[PDB]
Design a protein around this ligand. Structure first.
Ligand SMILES: [Cu+2]
Ligand SMILES: [Cu+2]
Ligand SMILES: [Cu+2]
Length: 130
């Protein structure tokens, strides 16, 4: 086989590689993440084709002048399945959620996520179509 999954994991840009590596070593049964990894600010579960999962996190855990990375920890996928997430304030002001897809070609459909700081909490809706 014949296994395919995506997840959505958030950490500081510095902690990204460490989270990816220990995630690989934790295996499929643990959603390819080390349980209770302190470096992981928020994460979805691992989902197969046709499934969906969401995660919500406090915007208080972020900071305006820091680099944050979102990525999939499924072994090898973090090469192309990564992107930046940054905190900003846009004149508006809201949308406090985003819809992300990972497909069969190791791709997220966005590579940059903006979180407004008027949001007290932020919501990621991950799907895995096909
Ligand atoms: Cu196999
Ligand atoms: Cu993936
Ligand atoms: Cu957790």
């Amino acid at each position: 086989m014949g296994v395919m999954g995506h997840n959505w994991v958030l950490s500081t840009a510095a902690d990204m590689q460490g989270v990816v590596t220990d995630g690989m070593a934790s295996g499929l049964d643990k959603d390819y993440l080390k349980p209770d990894d302190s470096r992981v600010i928020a994460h979805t579960k691992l989902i197969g084709s046709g499934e969906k999962d969401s995660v919500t996190f406090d915007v208080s855990k972020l900071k305006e002048g820091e680099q944050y990375m979102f990525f999939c920890t499924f072994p090898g996928h973090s090469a192309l399945m990564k992107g930046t997430l940054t905190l900003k304030g846009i004149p508006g002001g809201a949308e406090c959620s985003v819809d992300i897809q990972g497909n069969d070609q190791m791709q997220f459909n966005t590579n940059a996520i903006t979180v407004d700081k008027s949001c007290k909490q932020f919501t990621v809706n991950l799907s895995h179509p096909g």
